Structures are given as structure tokens and as C-alpha cells.
Design a protein around this ligand. Structure first.
Ligand SMILES: Nc1ncnc2c1ncn2[C@@H]1O[C@H](COP(=O)(O)OP(=O)(O)OP(=O)(O)O)[C@@H](O)[C@H]1O
Ligand SMILES: Nc1ncnc2c1ncn2[C@@H]1O[C@H](COP(=O)(O)OP(=O)(O)O)[C@@H](O)[C@H]1O
Ligand SMILES: [Ca+2]
Ligand SMILES: [Ca+2]
Ligand SMILES: [Zn+2]
Lengths: 71, 497
């Protein structure tokens, strides 16, 4: 439970490319393209939208945890 | 509550776990650890947060630009609880090669964070490709001699591309639309108060941007003010992203319009396609002269110097005159006059005076070497511009209108010599600040004789000759004052017969 939380924080830093605390659509596109994952731009924007509960266009750490620690 | 992409996130997390460190062969973990204080900034709240960080920085730079040199760095995260140096992230630490003031670093951080806010605002309009400006912070190495400051940012992997500069450069090779549309969007959405240019980075992850502001007082020495805006709009060819967000095109001359339209075929072959979810462009302003004169009229408070777009056009005029848009070639005078006309219609007093002098076939300062063709329409236009400038507070134009109503010099053919109006303008000039006694004596002469609507007034003629004599004094013109006193006595002598 403790190292899972640390793992989730590590996973958040993978996508929060600039480390401001928010995963943007551009950052997710950059990270997906760099890692060789094959997702279209529409799929990336939809990932951000799905995890964006507040509606700011970005994914904060709280929403990232909500998405990772899910049913 | 439902998440249908969790496995995409997790597959990416696993791919990263087995991804090699691009800087492994530089052995930064073997560098003696140094201690630093990190200042990070929030631009919405305008607030600074500081913390203590541990860094391992390369001893020699990997690249240098014009102003700064860059060092590879590893830094331990304070978001993680117990990160080891084997997993520390990669960072670029930039330092000014020439020593600068300590506030320059914080001002650059504010610049970058404001550009990031503008990128987010652009993203909120659902563009085909979203943008993001990398956060930049400061690290202070208080144990090094001098306690040096470094800018710190995350290292972006990929092809670093400069899409545009802060001085009209545009990357036409494999042209992209998002950077230029973003810059134009920042110009319009800010109400012409700023423009975010110098777009560069990896894909749409931008860093080292530049902001041109209306006042030009903030954001360092790269802020060329309205001139910088002009440099953008001299080269910007609006693309389909500009049009999908309702951005009005900048009014360019035919020569410039063709020079920027020459790449419309490449603009049509761009890969960035619109979806239709793009919304239309804190109070935004359009970039067209017609909509701007409509807005300025909607102000109703009849004004001058109330449009930044006019100042941009004036900057274009001065750039044309200075040789900024021509090569080792005669500079384009027709387009300079085009932008001067636009600046004048937008309430730039300098432009109005310039065009009044040019259409009146008179000597002028701005575009001095340009002489316009002489027509009757041009004479009427010159007098109208001079009268508008006179009512707007220009003393030279007030004296010229006074002389036009007095002698007829430079008077429009549709008007008539009116000595009461000439007296009005002479006095408006005298109450503002060629010498005073000359104009006072001219008024005195006009009232001594009368004519052109003005009735002979010996009393006021003598009073004004007395004022001119007192003004010849305070200028070391004794004999002139004596002659003016004599002329005052002459004017008064007519009232006793
Ligand atoms: N985060 C980054 N990731 C990768 N490369 C970077 C990064 N930041 C800067 N660079 C590289 O470092 C080079 C020089 O740094 P940069 O231009 O940002 O600063 P500068 O010297 O202030 O620039 P300028 O000369 O335009 O004033 C850049 O042209 C780019 O190639
Ligand atoms: N400007 C800022 N002001 C306050 N907190 C910030 C700021 N930028 C980022 N953070 C917070 O710091 C966390 C990242 O810290 P850390 O990993 O130490 O930074 P970096 O990734 O830049 O090395 C983010 O997830 C966010 O909570
Ligand atoms: Ca981010
Ligand atoms: Ca969010
Ligand atoms: Zn445009």
C-alpha cells in the first residue's frame, strides 16, 4: 500500500513531463510517441477527458490516483 | 467513475520502466552532489514557492545559445518520498553567459509561466493540436562562489525545432499551422496587449518563448513591443486554424500580401486538419482595420492613441523606412504609405501629422524622403488631416491651420480665408506654449486692419501689441519691444481720432 502509492507517484511523473503537477494533452502525446505506444491524437485527448473530473483540460495527481485506483 | 483507458496508461508505465536513460553515458550520478534552493512560480496567484533540492550537474556545457549556456543535470524529486539517483529525472540548467541582474531570471520565469497560461487558454478553444509550454524554475547554488542562479527545466527528448522567432522568422520547410495560429490567437485574445512568439521545442512542447507586450517594459530585452508584433504580422500568413477560431487577418499591403500568399499551396498541404470542434476566439480584439475603427467609434468618447493596432502599423512604417524589410534594394515606399494611412485612420497623431504634411506637399519627418503626387483631393486631404491634428493637440498643425486661415497658405480649395478662425488657432497655439511675439504681433496686425470676417478692433490690437512687446522682452529683443509698444500706441491712437 505504501510502495503502491510511491509507484503511483512515479507513474504520474512519467506523464507529467514538465513536473508542474498536471498531465496535459500535449505532454501525454509526447510521452506516448516517445514510448512507442500506438495511440491516435483523438485517443490521447479522450484519455485526458476521461480522467479529467474537474474539467480543466488536464489531469492532476488526485484524478490520476482516482483513475489508477479504480474498480 | 468508469475508466476505459487504464490499461493504456499501465502499458505506457511498463514501457517506460524498461526504457533506457538517454543520458546514461554522461555519468552524472558520479558527480559530487550540490545543494540548491529551488524557486518555482505560480502565475495565476503571482506567488513563489521555494524548497531545498539536491543536484548533480555536468561540469561543461552541452550547448550554448546567444544568451545562455546549457548544462545537463540530474535532480532528486521532492514529490517522491525516497528517490535514489539511479532513477532521478534529467534536466537542462541554463546560465547567462554574460552576467546579468538576479531579477532577470525571475522575470524569465514569469515570462515562461505567462506563455504557459496562454497555451492553456489556446487549448481551451479545442484546437486540432493542443500545445503546452514547459515549466521553468530557478535553482540557487548558495555554496558556489557568488551564489549563482540557474534556470531549470525538464529535458525534452526529440527533434528540437524553431517554428518562429521574435523577429519575423517563420519555418516554411514542412510548414506547421499550430505554432503560427497560437501566436495569432495570443495576439487577438489578449486584446492586442501581448503576443506569444519565438515558438520552439519538440512537437508542441514549447520552451524558451518570447512575449511582445504593448508597453514593452516587462519580460526582458526580447520584448520588442509593438515592433515585435509588427515583425510577426509582416510574415504571418493566416492558416485554417486562424480562420476556424475567427481571427481576422492583419491588413498587409499588396506586395506583402502576395509575398505571404506565395506559400498558400504549402499551407494547403499541411498535415494538421480541422475537426470542427474549434471554438471562436481578456477582452479579445480583431486584427482588421475595419473592425478596429468600428470598435474605436463604439468608444464614442471623441479618440487618439487608443488602438495598439495603429501603433503596430506605425512600427511597420518605421521598419520600412529603416530598411528592415528590404535586402542589399530600394525600400518599399508604397507599403510604408499604406501602413501610415492605416495608422492614421486608427488615431495615431504622428501618422495624421505626417499625412497632413505629405498631402500638403510639405516637409515631414516620418517617411521624409517620400513625396506624394499632388492632386486637389490630396490638398483637401492634407488640410483635413492637419485640422484633425490641430484639434488633437498638435502645435505645429495648429500653427499651419492658423496660417492657412490667415494667408491662404496650404488652405484647402473647399475652404475660405477666415481671420476669426485664424485668430482662434493662433491663440490655441499661444496658450499651449515661431516665437510668441511673432504670432502675437500677427494677431495685432489682423485686428489693426481687419478683414476676412474679422472686424477692425484697435483696442485689442493695441493690447496684443503690448503683449508682443512684453514677449519681445524676456527674449532680449529690446528694439523689437520698443517697436511693438509704438505700434500699440498707433493702434490705440485711432480711437481718439
Ligand atoms: N528542455 C530542453 N530539452 C532539450 N533541448 C533543450 C531544452 N532546452 C533547451 N534545449 C536546447 O538548448 C539550446 C539552447 O538553449 P535555449 O535556446 O533555450 O536558450 P538561450 O541561449 O536563452 O536562447 P536564445 O539564444 O534564443 O536567447 C536550444 O536551442 C535547444 O536546442
Ligand atoms: N510551481 C509550482 N508550485 C508549487 N508546486 C509545484 C509547482 N510545480 C510543481 N509543483 C508540485 O511539485 C510536484 C513535483 O515536484 P518535483 O518532482 O520535486 O519537481 P520536478 O519534477 O520539477 O523535479 C508536482 O507534482 C506538483 O505537486
Ligand atoms: Ca505538466
Ligand atoms: Ca484536472
Ligand atoms: Zn493568423
Amino acid at each position: 500500500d505504501t510502495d503502491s502509492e510511491e509507484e503511483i507517484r512515479e507513474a504520474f511523473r512519467v506523464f507529467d513531463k514538465d513536473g508542474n503537477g498536471y498531465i496535459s494533452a500535449a505532454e501525454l502525446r509526447h510521452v506516448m510517441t516517445n514510448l512507442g505506444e500506438k495511440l491516435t491524437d483523438e485517443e490521447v485527448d479522450e484519455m485526458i477527458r476521461e480522467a479529467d473530473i474537474d474539467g480543466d483540460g488536464q489531469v492532476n495527481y488526485e484524478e490520476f490516483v482516482q483513475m489508477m485506483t479504480a474498480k | 467513475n468508469s475508466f476505459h483507458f487504464k490499461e493504456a496508461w499501465k502499458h505506457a508505465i511498463q514501457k517506460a520502466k524498461h526504457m533506457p536513460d538517454p543520458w546514461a553515458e554522461f555519468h552524472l550520478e558520479d558527480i559530487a552532489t550540490e545543494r540548491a534552493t529551488r524557486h518555482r512560480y505560480n502565475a495565476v496567484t503571482g506567488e513563489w514557492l521555494d524548497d531545498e533540492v539536491l543536484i548533480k550537474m555536468a561540469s561543461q556545457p552541452f550547448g550554448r545559445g546567444a544568451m545562455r549556456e546549457c548544462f545537463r543535470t540530474k535532480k532528486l524529486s521532492n514529490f517522491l518520498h525516497a528517490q535514489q539517483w539511479k532513477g532521478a529525472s534529467n534536466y537542462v540548467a541554463k546560465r547567462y553567459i554574460e552576467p546579468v541582474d538576479r531579477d532577470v531570471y525571475f522575470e524569465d520565469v514569469r515570462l515562461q509561466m505567462e506563455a504557459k497560461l496562454w497555451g492553456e487558454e489556446y487549448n481551451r478553444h479545442k484546437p486540432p493540436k493542443q500545445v503546452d509550454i514547459m515549466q521553468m524554475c530557478i535553482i540557487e547554488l548558495k555554496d558556489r562562489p557568488g551564489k549563482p542562479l540557474f534556470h531549470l527545466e525538464h529535458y525534452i527528448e526529440g527533434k528540437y525545432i524553431k517554428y518562429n522567432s521574435n523577429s519575423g522568422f517563420v519555418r516554411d520547410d514542412n510548414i506547421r499551422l499550430t505554432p503560427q495560429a497560437f501566436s495569432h490567437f495570443t495576439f487577438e485574445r489578449s486584446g492586442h496587449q501581448l503576443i506569444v512568439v519565438d515558438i520552439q521545442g519538440v512537437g508542441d512542447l514549447y520552451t524558451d518563448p518570447q512575449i511582445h507586450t504593448e508597453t514593452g517594459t516587462d519580460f526582458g530585452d526580447g520584448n520588442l513591443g509593438v515592433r515585435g508584433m509588427a515583425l510577426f504580422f509582416y510574415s504571418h500568413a493566416c492558416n485554417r486554424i486562424c480562420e476556424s477560431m475567427g481571427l481576422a487577418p492583419f491588413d498587409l499591403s499588396p506586395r506583402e500580401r502576395d509575398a505571404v500568399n506565395q506559400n498558400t499551396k504549402l499551407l494547403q498541404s499541411a498535415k494538421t486538419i480541422l475537426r470542427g470542434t474549434e471554438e471562436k476566439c481578456h477582452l479579445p480584439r480583431a486584427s482588421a482595420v475595419a473592425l478596429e475603427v468600428q470598435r474605436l467609434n463604439a468608444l464614442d468618447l471623441e479618440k487618439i492613441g487608443k488602438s495598439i493596432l495603429g501603433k503596430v502599423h506605425l512600427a511597420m512604417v518605421r521598419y520600412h523606412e529603416g530598411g528592415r524589410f528590404c535586402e542589399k534594394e530600394e525600400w518599399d515606399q508604397e507599403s510604408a504609405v499604406f501602413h501610415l494611412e492605416h495608422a492614421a485612420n486608427l488615431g495615431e497623431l504622428e501618422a495624421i501629422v505626417g499625412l497632413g504634411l505629405m498631402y500638403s506637399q510639405l516637409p515631414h519627418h516620418i517617411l521624409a524622403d517620400v513625396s506624394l503626387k499632388e492632386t486637389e483631393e490630396n490638398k483637401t486631404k492634407g488640410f483635413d488631416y492637419l485640422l484633425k491634428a490641430a484639434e488633437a493637440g498638435d502645435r505645429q498643425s495648429m500653427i499651419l491651420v492658423a496660417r492657412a486661415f490667415d494667408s491662404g497658405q496650404n488652405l484647402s480649395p473647399d475652404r475660405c480665408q477666415d481671420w476669426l478662425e485664424a485668430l482662434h488657432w493662433y491663440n490655441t497655439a499661444l496658450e499651449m506654449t515661431e516665437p510668441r511675439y511673432m504670432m502675437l504681433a500677427r494677431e495685432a496686425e489682423m485686428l489693426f486692419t481687419g478683414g476676412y470676417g474679422l472686424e477692425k478692433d484697435p483696442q485689442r490690437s493695441g493690447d496684443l501689441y503690448t503683449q508682443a512687446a512684453e514677449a519681445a522682452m524676456e527674449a532680449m529683443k529690446g528694439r523689437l519691444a520698443n517697436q511693438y509698444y509704438q505700434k500699440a500706441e498707433e493702434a490705440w491712437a485711432q480711437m481718439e481720432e
